[PDB]
């Protein structure tokens, strides 16, 4: 009876593969050992009393996982003990569920209620796994056992998640995707076709919500999910699960061709939104989440099963987790056959919006100086999970996040931390603009915290270009603060001769009115030196400000460099020094902060940053260069080039061109020249004059060496 | 000509091994590649201008490293390009060194000056490496080149390091070992036997100083170096280097048998004083230093060449660094031959003092619940790098430091941080007792920071016992504070029935006068719960105190739990929760701190801790249990047992016995019973009554399960 993600054909293929040495057999033996041990322990289907991370919540989660794993073993081995365990647990659920009220630890202000769980989302995950387990063990049951499980457990849960909470079922968000996927698959297993249609087109079958609306709205043409990478991988699992079930049940729907293969694009982009295996922590996001997460392990197997792309074996190899499925077997076989090819992590502008015209998530990468990623976020809001952070950036180098995004104020599945829920400081700190590396006007967050306006306004991607020496993008938004135009261009560059790299930042603010302008740099590392006088406050600390996140920042020190070049140098665990060299006009303060004020429940990390503060400016440009330099090896006990190699910095406008000149110690000046305007063909010619000589280049941009 | 660590026998064996494939050939090729690349850069022997971490400091360090490596490559390849580079660098040193003043960035308060370097310590390392390089390339030289090199560089350096700085040269400390090693090896190479004898017996050759006194004084009979693990590995290099040269030139001295084989013991104990490859950060210490440090890579090859112990190959394998020497070949061959045997990290009391009577460094390990180490420090002062930390402890679990020692306030080889020197806050914070996990009386450090009193006093180790279920040690000191006695016993225990483990702490304070008593607990991880009301200060922070390190702690929160059981729970990145359960009397405050006050140069990390404070006590006992519990997996997204499983705690005396009974939720109480007397035969019988039942055990201690 398996006919959801796994079908009978997959079981027969798995049965043959299990008795041949290889990755698949070894994964099978490991699952079998674990399930056999778990079968020794009595079933635990407790009355639900705990919130996220609590015993009842985690036990119910463990139950769905065991029921799925045992069902897979039952199909492969034909051993009845696996089905009997799944049956006994389902009979227990069938007796418990009808008697359950809404969860005692429900918090409806945060999320909709569940019966098994504090929130409906976990119940939806439970249905997605449990329906598959039932589908896998259904041939083992008597008719009365099936009827009791369906009438007491499966149908009441399907009803609870759909007709009984219809607003969320018809919503176009990850929570909707989980609910639609579970009820739709239940429609297939229990022969309820209307449930499949309700999953695809909403409860009214209108078309306004449902699975198809989600695929047409939440993803851009580049496969980029509007809520961001961390919820991208989360929603991926019900997308590829229900899509695999649609293809096995109604292949005439052409689900894997729908919207020009959007399901495959979505899988691939999920992989791309990572560095050193971790998803970029933009918007609401837990920084530990990586590509070995179960949703992307599954997604890769499904995409490899559809395409046979050997590049996906590279990812599967890094995930270190063989799945007991037909597609999981295909992955295991390609790996055993040596078919692996490297996976191409791209510099790319992943467009945002269903039509691709609501900004973009830009990733700039280069390997000349090690693994480096500059992540630029001129993206749309991302809805409730979105941060108020237009044009913010991050910088990754040598395995580590150097210029940082906080992610969410949330301790996942830690019940003592408010049931693992999003904390108050996720609104008052983590979402605020001052928590990001982008301009804050008048100590006020972008859109002044107005969700509806934020949801309707987005930056415009002006351009993106990437070649071997220059990766560069610019974007603009005039709606973050009406009357203020915010424009940023960021370049990731490398010089082949030196082996050196730079991140270059040109942040232009233009207003007809005077404003306070803050540009934070939140960094990871230890402050080691400054160009200018800086002594920290010594016997008391006070918060930087009063609202919009400023109330959480302790002010540790205040500097006001003389006009010219300001330099801030820190040292990272990864063995590198980082110096930001910025142009200051003598009216710019540098405020050094530590996160942790107005934090009575110890909910925030002691993160460090410095803010460039320019008061009373109508128009201002923040020009800066981030220089990774030197080597620090505390094991062999040597240090090289600990001092910044930048001596001078100049920024000039030359018609439609922007020039950034970086003077290097005992070295040639690095001169970034790029064309500023919208459309620039690849062979367009440019010249300009710098220091009495003439320079010429084709296309968007060129880095010159001036000896 | 090579006759020091490397002799001609070694060279011959290496030459035949570099043709055959294997670990040695791969190391050779990697070295040859690095040096060949170095040879294409012209030599740089600059006039010394910078302090530690600066250009000339790090260049002169690069130079001795390259001279040694190029010299070894000369001997193996017989290719004069390597010797010619070494020759040309030494001729530049011969011309430069006699013109040199004392170093312009000398800081004679911190360390004695050098000429090549700001301190003579680096000059001694330079000599140790360079005398070996000169020895390796000598047969390539003309007599006039040899005379110029010896007259202008080698002899002036050796003379500057001995007769011109005689106090330090005759000193018995790590600075002394480096100086005497270089001069003694110069004595062998330049045929100055008086220098060899001065190296072994001091300049006046009295025997008060010198290398034999160092081996007889700075190590205990257990091979524990008095200054601590971080300086043990430092001194280990000159110790084993000179010893190996002595054995190759004067094997009649039997140096590897001297003092019951102290050198081999010294190597083995250096390996023992680590957890997950890092040395215990006690006394002045840099936390990143681990067993791959060059001194211990060398010491392990030399011990393997002496003893052939296949267990040393385990360490070598973990170090991942084959050495181009005769011993390093033998190590590579044994590894290739698959002779590796697991190295045994033991529970052990490493005695302190020349004769092993000045306290001890006690390490308790178990493996039942993962890799765990309890480090207890009832040790001698350790001279000027010693910390004021009698009876302090650390806890390590699942790869991480959980209960912490700060180590030193110093940024090794970062010139912008005071030349990589020990910083002011090393004295005012890192050495202070409040920075450690031990009792502070009246906000005053042990011995009141008086180094002369501290050097004359040490705790007495009372007992130490390790079996598979209980590891336990106790010690006491009555001289840390006038009229106050301090006694601590620490136990590491495991229960087989559950996978559970506990660290048990009983800290007794006895005095005829009332005092304020502080017991800090410095922890690594995120605070997640308390069983008593705790709200952090929200709008400002102020230092906890005014002196002896209290001026560096921000007080973030204050709690006063009710009489009974206090519980503090934090979450560590290793995926485990930790709960300290402590007995409190309603009069004990718990103060939550963050390091960072009075730190104007950003010299301190933001470390966290909590302090149990009890005022007006004459005698008081701090009883607590540290419980690692649960699993936190944010990749798979599950949590198990996040809540502490301790329900109750009781401490009782029963004659010569102490009882600690730990109530477990849904579990048998764990009852630790141990005899307190110094003398306890293994077959001694103990009997006590607890809750109506009678219990008996043989020997020192036993953990009982009470259902
Ligand atoms: Zn964010
Ligand atoms: Zn210390």
Automatic annotation (TrEMBL), chains A, B:
Its EC number is 4.2.2.3. Keywords: Lyase, Metal-binding, Zinc. Zn(2+) binds at residues 387, 405, 436. The keyword Metal-binding applies. This is Alginate lyase AlgL17. It comes from Microbulbifer sp. (strain ALW1).
